[PDB]
Amino acid sequence: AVNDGDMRLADGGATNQGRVEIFYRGQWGTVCDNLWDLTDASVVCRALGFENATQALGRAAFGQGSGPIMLDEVQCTGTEASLADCKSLGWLKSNCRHERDAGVVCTNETTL
Numbered sequence: 001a002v003n004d005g006d007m008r009l010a011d012g013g014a015t016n017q018g019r020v021e022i023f024y025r026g027q028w029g030t031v032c033d034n035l036w037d038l039t040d041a042s043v044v045c046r047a048l049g050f051e052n053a054t055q056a057l058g059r060a061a062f063g064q065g066s067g068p069i070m071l072d073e074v075q076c077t078g079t080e081a082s083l084a085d086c087k088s089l090g091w092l093k094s095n096c097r098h099e100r101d102a103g104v105v106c107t108n109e110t111t112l
């Protein structure tokens with residue numbers, strides 16, 4: 001049971017870090033690192049149940065993903081439930097390639 005805006009971290013080794021992947025209308029895709037910051041990273045981490053983000057990484061730090069680039073130039077206030085609720089260029093709007101895939105490092109506790 002997955003809905004639009006649902007997220008997951010991949011290829012991180014641990015469960016509290018990885019490449020950010022997000023669901024939309026039936027498929028998973030990645031997020032471009034343009035303007036990717038710590039406030040954006042904390043929205044992902046808290047949604048996934050961690051206390052906070054410690055690092056917002058870009059340039060496919062956890063490897064390049066596959067699928068469409070879902071979001072780009074994400075500007076969160078920090079109080080959002082999902083990256084889908086943050087300001088961005090809109091779903092599927094991006095000129096980036098997977099080598100720009102954004103990632104995060106969250107707290108163990110449960111610029112670009």
Ligand SMILES: *[C@@H]1O[C@H](CO)[C@@H](O)[C@H](O)[C@H]1NC(C)=O
Nearest residue numbers: 038042046051052053054078
């Ligand atoms: C999350 O971590 C950053 C790092 O300094 C901090 O500014 C922020 O207040 C922390 N907590 C929350 C709930 O955002």
